Homo-oligomer: A and B are copies of this chain.
Amino acid sequence: GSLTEDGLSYKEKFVVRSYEVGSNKTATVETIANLLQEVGCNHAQSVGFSTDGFATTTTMRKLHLIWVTARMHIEIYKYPAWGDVVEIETWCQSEGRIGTRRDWILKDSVTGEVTGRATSKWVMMNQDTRRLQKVSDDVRDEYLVFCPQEPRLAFPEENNRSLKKIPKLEDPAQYSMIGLKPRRADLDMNQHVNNVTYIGWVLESIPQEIVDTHELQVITLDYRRECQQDDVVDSLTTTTSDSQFLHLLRLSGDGQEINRGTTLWRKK
């Protein structure tokens, strides 16, 4: 892993592991998402951000602020096979006072061909009160020294999938997976549920026949509220159509929304 020549992006290579692949002998979308998180953490560490689970700046630590994901959007053209080397390039950009964006490009190391891309929106939050905040001018200055000044987007197209509004699934759902609970392997070093665990929970309500005959092309996921270590989740899915689905994760009891999303699947 290393910062590129100009120091405004980071690259890292990964050899796809035996336990990281699904029935097709290629990396799962959850393996891909963990690799994106890993290269994001290595980029933050390389530019001097805190190494205590929260990649905060000096001003964020002074005001007890943390970055939290609001949206994850991933598009895969080719999933790497077991033993293949995938190269991932990541960079960050400020989006005024709204928040920040982290983008990724995935490539086949042998051919140099782009096999996937991802983008994520992050918002400022006070870690004590859990109240969302706008980005201050001081933290905007700290981010600017490590981000490209001219816009660089993994998804540049005007009016693209990564920016589409997601509706709320209405009961009854076509499919559901009930009583999903996180175990210790689903938590991060700060004992919060890993962002990738939610992708797995969304996918749990897709019928096995869809997973067996189709490959996942796009996933867009909104994060609304965190699932606590002792919470229980229900994963709901309805076909909206290629095959397209609308998704909802909500707490098992009162039905409080935690995530909403969409997936696009191509026939194998």
Contacts and interface: CB of A to CB of B under 8 A. Distances in A.
Interface in A35-66: 37-38, 41-42, 45, 51-53
A28 B188 CA distance: 11
A207 interface: no
B189 A22 contact: yes
Which of A82, A189, A196 is most buried by chain B, counting CB atoms within 10 A of its CB? A189
A201 B183 contact: yes
A131 interface: no
Interface in A180-204: 180-181, 183-185, 187-191, 194, 196, 200-201, 203-204
Interface residues of A, number: 39
Nearest to A40: B18
A227 to B, nearest CB: 14
7 contacts: A19-B38, A25-B53, A28-B185, A179-B181, A180-B181, A180-B183, A183-B201
A159 interface: no
Given A18-B38, A21-B189, A38-B18, A184 B196 contact: no
A69 interface: no
A38 B21 contact: no
A187 B196 CA distance: 16
Q: Lowest 9 A-B CB distances belong to which pairs?
A: A18-B41, A17-B38, A185-B200, A21-B189, A30-B185, A19-B34, A183-B204, A25-B189, A183-B200
A41 B16 CA distance: 12
